Amino acid sequence: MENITSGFLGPLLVLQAGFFLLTRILTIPQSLDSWWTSLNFLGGTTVCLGQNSQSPISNHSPTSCPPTCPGYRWMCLRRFIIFLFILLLCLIFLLVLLDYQGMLPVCPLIPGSSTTSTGPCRTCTTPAQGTSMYPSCCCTKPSDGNCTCIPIPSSWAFGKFLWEWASARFSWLSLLVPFVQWFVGLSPTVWLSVIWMMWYWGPSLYSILSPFLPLLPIFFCLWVYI
């Protein structure tokens, strides 16, 4: 009866979904390379001499050229460059996922004195070596036995942890922090306006600022000496 239909239809859906989803994710790289054509067709009148008259003569446009004839031995090269990049984009999406799910670990170890525990300290840490840096918290201190450090946060990931790390390793990031805060204070009335003014207005000032850009190192050195 209709019972066998339940089992049979699953195979049909699996086959259809697999075919479509395998064709599309494998045709996307060539689609992106033909999206660069935005450059390639920016000049216009795209006709590849790679479709040279070696085996056949018909000028096979300039995107796929001849499938094999004359110049066709570089579609593999552009693919080779591109599909592995889509993989790196997927890896970045994965990294964002760990930050958002809070599931990903962010066990931190930095010098501090924040206390949140039950009947804690009165022995604490007395490490007079290795500066103020902390090592894996099995028992960080050379002689710590009852040690307990700090658990991973439900907020921002090692993104924030590396914010702290870079602030420790750099100095100018702290001065950029006011600029970062002011950029964070950008509503759609502010966020959109910057992008709108970005187009067809910045290149003109760029040529003039190029002489100005060449003269910022002297100001930096002047303040460094001061």
Place this chain on the structure above:
Amino acid sequence: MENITSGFLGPLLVLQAGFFLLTRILTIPQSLDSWWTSLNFLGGTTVCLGQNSQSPISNHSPTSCPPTCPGYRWMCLRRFIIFLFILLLCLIFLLVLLDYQGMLPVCPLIPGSSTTSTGPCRTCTTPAQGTSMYPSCCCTKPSDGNCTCIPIPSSWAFGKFLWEWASARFSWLSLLVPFVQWFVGLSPTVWLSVIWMMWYWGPSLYSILSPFLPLLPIFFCLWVYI
């Protein structure tokens, strides 16, 4: 007579180095895109057809033609995109070196009775659903429980961390991962041969692979039934 000499010599080094760094940073963006003109050389003629003869009659062509005349607006957005990409590349190199510092902590969890040193269990018993990634293990349990848990162990900070979730949501092809280990032995004197073999014979087998690729879902379903 050397303190002023040292201060001046340092200014000369700063002037040389900062300017060289700025020039190199400028050259890279209009560097990778020209490389990409492998498309043009795979296409054939390399010429800016968009060289509008209105202001500049210069048929000098060969791309990067006018900084200002004709179309120049895309010539800059693309430099910005490829600049952010190479920025992504240098970031991933940074994550590689974070993987190598040894102090990048994974702070992972797994069920086992092992210990890095003398660890008294004292009837360590408190289990929970999802033993992997359990509570903070700051003795966070119905009682303290005399708990000792994992520090950030010294290992590939990246692979040993990522593989955990990889296997958690994977091991469909962990057998292929053993095959990956079985094949990873071709790095010296065989890697170049494999790369050359891929170069010479890459396209011919694609037609056969494509015809067999549709049959692969059938074999996958057969495995799903076997």
